């Protein structure tokens, strides 16, 4: 399941997320949310959870960047004013 | 079909559900489970599903409340430690 969120960067000054990079002997795993801090715009929405994969932010698609470039772009965008839209793929299960 | 599931919040941080409210022109249709987080207590029990309707939490009936007041109650109760009982209607 894919989900799309909008964060109001008016009230909040930061997302409150850690970003964990999966890399392997291929290293293209992607980037995921590790934890979420109370106090930020993500916790206030409720939707995202640790382990969610981050696919795209405002438009930029991260599915084929390197982990280090997708974060370089996330950093620059939270570093500017304006609403931040995120879309993520949510964690799965079954063993 | 109306089920009653009991959940342990000891074992989890959240119920893991988003809550979606329908409203008519008059007023309210009620509140429903819009999506399930794995990860939470609800998916861990497996019995409720997306589209189900939430009738009562913990002996408190939402049957005539407004959407908003019922979501207040619901939040007020979740925020407490303890087991949580949900009564919900299966989507047919």
């Amino acid at each position: 399941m894919i989900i799309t969120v909008t964060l109001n960067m008016e009230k909040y000054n930061f997302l409150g997320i850690s970003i964990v990079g999966q890399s392997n002997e291929r290293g293209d795993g992607g980037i995921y949310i590790g934890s979420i801090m109370k106090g930020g715009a993500v916790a206030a929405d409720g939707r995202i959870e640790p382990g969610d994969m981050l696919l795209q932010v405002n438009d930029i698609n991260f599915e084929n960047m390197s982990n280090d470039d997708a974060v370089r772009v996330l950093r620059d965008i939270v570093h500017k004013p304006g609403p931040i839209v995120l879309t993520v793929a949510k964690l799965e299960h079954h063993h | 079909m109306i089920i009653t599931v009991t959940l342990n919040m000891e074992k989890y941080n959240f119920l893991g559900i988003s809550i979606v409210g329908q409203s008519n022109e008059r007023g309210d249709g009620g509140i429903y489970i819009g999506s399930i987080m794995k990860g939470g207590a609800v998916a861990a029990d497996g019995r409720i599903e997306p589209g189900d309707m939430l009738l009562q939490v913990n002996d408190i009936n939402f049957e005539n409340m407004s959407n908003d007041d019922a979501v207040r109650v619901l939040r007020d109760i979740v925020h407490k430690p303890g087991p949580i009982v949900l009564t919900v209607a299966k989507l047919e």
């Binding site: 939707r47 | 979501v71 939040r75």
Partner: peptide, 8 residues
């Protein structure tokens, strides 16, 4: 008309 209310 659906509105997302919150999540918990």
């Amino acid at each position: 008309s659906l509105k997302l209310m919150t999540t918990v």
